[PDB]
Symmetry: T
Subunit: 164 residues, 12 copies
């Protein structure tokens, strides 16, 4: 699958991993995925945020399981995923996620509540703590704004108990 | 039911309506709903945002339907709603929302995908364009950040077609 | 001879939700009575509250109302309470629907409230309301004929 | 202005199956027209055959009938074909039920034929038939008003 | 449809009506329907029984409804029916039977409990007071032996109450 | 459980085993089970039939499984059973029946098609080749008349292939 | 020691809906207490409003009520909200039903509210209410014993 | 006045399965009677056999037992037979459950045997048994008043 | 070599129900045969009667028809009878659908009759009928080759 | 004019899984084209990977393929992704099945991918593939006629 | 070290129901122990009675049995009681199936008793029994190692 | 004598997901063979890819593997394709589960893959793998005895 990433300088620093599910490579709303990624980057460079993104799209469920598994070599501290149609079917990823080790957030462009009966459950989303759907590309940024706060708060907490 | 609101000065200006469902008046995480509201207000005064909020909680499905119906006296231009347990059952509010006239966003503290079978469907969120669940109080701000962008883009659009 | 019309949730919103208001439906009804020359006091009550329909039906049980026409709206599909209430009304209740609830989503198909009513008119738009007057008038006429047929022998 | 009434299976059996016959229901209808002074030719057709209802509706598609009132009876719950047929009728079809099919066994609850018709009258006993005439008259009146409203501008 | 009948002399006399559903006309076990009928007649002429049968097969659900409706012109006093595949689907005959006026018995060559999930319910058999299935042609005679006893007992009963 | 039997002389001879389900011991229509048994006996002594019955009622599902297993010590050559409510639940007896080795017929006084949803399936009857239900006590005799014919025809058949 | 009794929709209609009123049920309870010599202030509240049950339970959370006996009635089967409420009451809630809701239609079988309450009495007619007092008295007694057993060591 | 208490499968295991035995439950009952000054012979029977419950209920039908309290345990959810048995007992049967079967797995939610019983106590732990005595006493008392009210006129 | 084509309910209504008649479909087939130079007598039969499909299939069992192409229409989803009939035809039956019945409402998804046929063509509009001829020709050809392959050794 | 043939999981196993290989199926197609004198480049791709079907479909979206024939095999029943893919292919997709998936286990009945494709051929054994060529040829021919019919006026 | 083997209904019938008896299965087990040189007293108990399995498991709770291997047979699918029992066994219970219950009718797919056991062997024919011994030996060995690892520190 | 072990998705993650790795499981197996003195070449393959399990099984069909042990993991519940593949393996496949998939969520209860396999070991943790070797060894031994029993007469 496909993979973009930007760099980051070196003076906290939060590495985040975005995983885009099958067919998401194809948007082209009238907006494209690369565009959804600059929107994300634009919203960080902009928010004033020491966040590094890694972007990842694939059509292969195994490639999505692999990628999560990699992350567990503690690099990035959280995952933003839109499993595509795998949301509805794939227990195997739901499992990947539950032994992800870190925050995961599911994001869906459409409102899957409001579509075909079959799209209504996501197993994957049941396993991410949080789920965003319905918002169009705008949803990713919500997942980003959220991710930031989660991690932040965790850092402030790991520094909480680890003194006494 | 109960209702808070802050004021706003008079020099665009977006009035937004927050509706909290039944039992939400009870939180006291270890955070309370008034607290969830200042967090919201804090995130506006802070984001630098001409947004006026109105906060509203009730245990009464009718009172939720009433309030939406009132909004349709074009004041506020969108709604953020956590219908609580009424999400799962109440077609009547789903209906209220589908003839709401404006952007509606559903917010849930818990991740309802991940709870009892009965909590899995929300008819109301199938009628809001977008849904947020899973995020704790943080979710509300996501709905706020989103609401802003929606309206914004709408204003920019109503000014789009209305020239030619 | 006085009849109660009970309109459910969202029904008041007609004209934002064809382009016709609930007020206009009510006056249509008048026009049908005021015209059909039928001795009928109508009263309109609309609410978005399940409890307020229940209350109102419970309040009917005192003389002056001989029948209730009701569009429980969305509560039709879900409100076992309103159906329970309709059954103790002990007097004609007729359920009306603007649309054909057979013909929309799954969750609208069944009506609890409808089963409790003697009979259901649906998918006629407002005409169904006049249809309901039409029937109420008949049943009340017939009932009235019968309790004099017997309480005479 | 000529209207078709289609009665489904078993319906002819009324008086062995209250104590009233299908014939009487028909003449009631007459009495309602013959009385309501409405220019309406009615025709009655009863059958226990799914195919015969389908045939009859397909035959309506030729002028002289402007609308159909129909009680598919038991076929209501099961006949996708009749429903399909009612949908090409391209002219008002109104479904009538003597009983409230909401209020009997599970298998009667849905009506396929009902969904295809614009609207459904149920649980009124025979009155529902007059109810149906009442509606048909109105829609045909309105339709007629409209095709002259436009085909004038 | 098709229709066989034998005659009977004139010196109680029980007229019985057998109705064979769709496709039953086709057997040819390695036994045919006419054969199933002689077996029946053979078992009456044989049992020593003042019974007159009328045999009736059709493919048309309407024709089965018609025939029952006819019977209600009190000729025969009971019906033996194998609705075939219409068992499982046809409410309309179930209804015909429920306002049949007299004893009805459903017979099935096969054991419908023991076949495709769809064959498991018969609505028609739910409305007959009794149901035989599983016995092959032998089934019909069971229905005949039973029909005899039912009617008999009824005659003995109508003569029971109608004296006092 | 309980068990009746009559004797039989010694000059073909068919031994048959009747098994009555739980609660059947309680009838007392207005007829009792012993009565249902003499009706049976009466219909054999009467039909002119070299049949020996053994009657058996119990409340214990094990005791029914036991008794079938016993039969397999080839005594009687067929079983008539009314598993009572165990019809609907007990796979374990359905299995006993399927490795019964001989004709089994299920009899039910009521018409189980026409009762509570739960009584609609009988797993046992799915395993008997044939099922009678709806007939009141008269049902048993139908099972008897049938049993006779089945066995008969089998004897006639075992003498069929066993010559060439 | 003060206990709240919450009666649900339609429950007030007893005497039109055997031949006994809600008032009579309540005075029965009194008679059981007034007689049982038990230190128990009772309060009765009946409503046809889902919200008002919720509000009332939430209002209990302030001292003087130590327990709630509650017949959610129709809301029993459908009201996640009231069950959610009962769960934060943090103090005994006992559900009562006049009838045996196992023993009616499908839709009454489950109770959401019952699952949230510790225990459910059903099918006893009014006796079940005294039954409920019986139990509340016991749990409160035991709880009270225990918080003194511990807050002593 | 003699009452039969029937304990179902595994119920004898209490103390390995809070920390209380079935013996203790039974003596509690005694204490409640022995104390309530109520003329009540109790008998206890516990079994892991569906058949033995059936047999025991059928055996009750002979004089000296006027009522049955019964915790069918696991058989509650599956035993049509025991429910059929309970229904010919012709004499009060009350189901008790230690836990609130609404509040566990799907498969425990319905009780066949409970529907057959007049009423069900659940989720009270052992208290429910005394609760059951409480009720049986009342019903028997009332029944007995009534057969003398009538067999006098 | 003679083939039966069986069109089901409503299928005759094409041109009121794109803009193409059943007649045109049939002549298309001809054109495909008349052109494909294939020795094929075709016969067309359309009906709105479940029975008449059954009768027609049963009648095929006599020589001259070697195969059946059939669009049961609506009866596809419900007719166990027709499926049973197709299964004793003992000779190729091919089901055709204009539309892709996977792609409409739930109730059209399964076809009983289709499972009975050896193979189903669907969603091709009229082209599927020529598609069907295409197949029949092949199967008949192959079968014919084989009964000569064997009845030779 | 170039067409892509997509064979799904296990389909390569034909010859161990009648006694015919996937290679033979493909050369048959050739023979049908090579014979039908039709201007058609075919390409065969078989995979046991859901993703590789997806990738392959997405890769089609670049010129030279005008259509896809596809036997998703097992993924037919479960792969929402492939069905989603087929839907953006924006160019004819035809699903083929060797067997009649109506006629096996429950889980094979529905096909997600089939609903996505315009039309589905099933139960024909390998013939269905030639049947598929037959159809693709026709649609492409017709489409091509049409874009010249219009882009001329 | 003594182990209980519990065989359920019908299991004794092997050899009328491959051609192997229950006795032979048991002696096989012996042969595996007698051979594997494992210190293991086995006991065999077969029954057709749900209550007898329950009784036997309840009887295990006394010393000398350290583990149970069990084929509940048909009760697997239905007996909530036996599962309940297996849960208080407080000692290893292993479920065995001759066949693969996944691979037969719907009703056999789930096992209640299997969920209550730590682990299930199925579809191995008799070999599964030896498989079970193999496991029991291991867990007992491990448990035993552990209670000496700790009760030492 | 060489055997394939196929580990499914996530299985490699043991030690982040008791505290044991997949490597350790494999070496345990060695220890069991290396110890059991059995002539067995084992190979381990783990993948998170449905297609790779299917490929690997399809690759087995060439000599040197006589059997496959497999934990399809999450694909167990959903992969019709893998089950389809396991069925053409034409050689013993045994499914192993660390946990008791009966005893977790609904969605894990059924195994497609398991029904295709001859037999399934589950809920034993790693021991189940040695269990599997134990069985494979036996079947292969027996099969081998048999093809020499016959191909001798
Ligand atoms: O982002 C989404 O909306 C989605 O995950 C993408 C493609 C579809 O398969 C999903 O149902 C929704
Ligand atoms: O915000 C929520 O999580 C919720 O809407 C509140 C209360 C519960 O009834 C809902 O399931 C979740
Ligand atoms: O009037 C009607 O058509 C309706 O009762 C009103 C509102 C909706 O919720 C119902 O589904 C239909
Ligand atoms: O007229 C009626 O009520 C009905 O349509 C007639 C016959 C029955 O089969 C329907 O269920 C109701
Ligand atoms: O006699 C019978 O077995 C049957 O009624 C005949 C044909 C099939 O449709 C039924 O399922 C059984
Ligand atoms: O004979 C009978 O009808 C029955 O088998 C007896 C008792 C009930 O449990 C069955 O449902 C019917
Ligand atoms: O008290 C009762 O029995 C009930 O709770 C009251 C009203 C009905 O809605 C319930 O189903 C039963
Ligand atoms: O007493 C009880 O709680 C129960 O009746 C006994 C055992 C369990 O099987 C039931 O689910 C509840
Ligand atoms: O040809 C068809 O597409 C169909 O078989 C005809 C009529 C409809 O009833 C079917 O659903 C589709
Ligand atoms: O080609 C077929 O018949 C099929 O698509 C192939 C493999 C199986 O998985 C499907 O169920 C049918
Ligand atoms: O395979 C077995 O051993 C089984 O447990 C025994 C009897 C049957 O009832 C089960 O379904 C399988
Ligand atoms: O090994 C197991 O226990 C399992 O097969 C592995 C992963 C999970 O997805 C299964 O449910 C169980």
């Amino acid at each position: 699958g496909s993979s973009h990433h930007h760099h980051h300088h070196s003076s906290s620093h939060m590495k985040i991993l975005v995983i885009q599910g099958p067919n998401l490579n194809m948007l082209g709303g009238m907006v494209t995925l690369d565009q959804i990624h600059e929107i994300m980057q634009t919203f960080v460079k902009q928010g004033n945020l020491d966040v590094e993104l890694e972007f990842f799209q694939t059509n292969f469920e195994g490639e999505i399981i692999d990628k999560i598994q990699e992350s567990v070599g503690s690099d990035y501290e959280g995952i933003i995923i839109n499993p595509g149609a795998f949301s509805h079917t794939s227990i195997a990823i739901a499992d990947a996620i539950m032994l992800a080790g870190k925050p995961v957030i599911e994001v869906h462009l459409t409102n899957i509540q409001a579509r075909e009966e079959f799209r209504k459950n996501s197993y994957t989303g049941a396993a991410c703590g949080g789920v965003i759907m319905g918002f169009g590309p705008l949803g990713y940024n919500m997942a980003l704004m959220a991710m930031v706060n989660i991690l932040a708060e965790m850092k402030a907490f790991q520094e909480a108990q680890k003194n006494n």
